[PDB]
Design a protein around this ligand. Structure first.
Ligand SMILES: [Mg+2]
Length: 281
């Protein structure tokens, strides 16, 4: 199965129809806090907000808002934090979240600049000797090492909480080759990226949830966790053909709006899972 559906939707050409049905059935929940006037500058897009019920709260109060959601997958025993690309004014808040939630990894699925426009602040240091200090949230960030490969980069970062003096090692997994328009033609490198993040331990229960983002934190970000979770379920269940990707997507959409932004992203999600399932045997 799944193959059968993918093949049928392809030859019938009904990806938009299938995808619009998902948007129709998707959950709606309030975003009261996001839409507060004081949080205008904390949101990259006006149509992408975290639900109040699943929003991640910062502890350093006065303002606890950040555009990020906890996607908690019960059956798969997997949690993710999906968030927007940090803004110039929210880089401190982002590393505060990473700290307070005890995350081990940050997964980044966008370039800083795409289509001639800045889609993300430069929130991590690029030279070892030029560390970053975030004074508002009181954190120091140092680049420890960098490993540039053809489809992705991995960085070891050191996050220091300056008020306690504790330090943590954070792994930055940066997927660099997602095309400016649409989706990749083969999911091979995206899957190799997924398995590389898995292999680090960054998705395991011992740590806080992985922090995942693209620009809006719903498109490519949603593709990443949808594929991961579907692939887990196929390992866990008796009869792995019971895994319905649309149902899993609707479950994730209970926790964050607009996950999977296009019908090509849906098609690609299917494609990744199918091929990813064939690798694990
Ligand atoms: Mg150097």
């Amino acid at each position: 199965e799944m193959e059968k559906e993918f093949e049928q939707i392809d030859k019938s050409g009904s990806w938009a129809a299938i995808y619009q049905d998902i948007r129709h059935e998707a959950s709606d929940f309030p975003c009261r806090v996001a839409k507060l006037p004081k949080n205008k500058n904390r949101n990259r897009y006006r149509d992408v907000s975290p639900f109040d019920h699943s929003r991640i709260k910062l502890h350093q109060e006065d303002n606890d808002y950040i555009n990020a959601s906890l996607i908690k997958m019960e059956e798969a025993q997997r949690s993710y934090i999906l968030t927007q690309g940090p803004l110039p004014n929210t880089c401190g808040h982002f590393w505060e979240m990473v700290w307070e939630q005890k995350s081990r990894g940050v997964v980044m699925l966008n370039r800083v600049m795409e289509k001639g426009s800045l889609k993300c602040a430069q929130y991590w240091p690029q030279k070892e000797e030029k560390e970053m200090i975030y004074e508002d949230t009181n954190l120091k960030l140092t680049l420890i090492s960098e490993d540039i490969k053809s489809y992705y980069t991995v960085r070891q970062l050191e996050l220091e909480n300056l008020t306690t003096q504790e330090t943590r090692e954070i792994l930055h997994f940066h997927y660099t080759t997602w095309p400016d328009f649409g989706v990749p033609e083969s999911p091979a490198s995206f899957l190799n990226f997924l398995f590389k993040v898995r292999e680090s331990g960054s998705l395991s229960p011992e740590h806080g949830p992985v922090v995942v983002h693209c620009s809006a934190g719903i498109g490519r970000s949603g593709t990443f966790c949808l594929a991961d979770t579907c692939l887990l379920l196929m390992d866990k269940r008796k009869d792995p053909s019971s895994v319905d990707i649309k149902k899993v997507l609707l479950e994730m959409r209970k926790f964050r709006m607009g996950l999977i932004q296009t019908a090509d992203q849906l098609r690609f999600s299917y494609l990744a899972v199918i091929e990813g399932a064939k690798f694990i045997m």
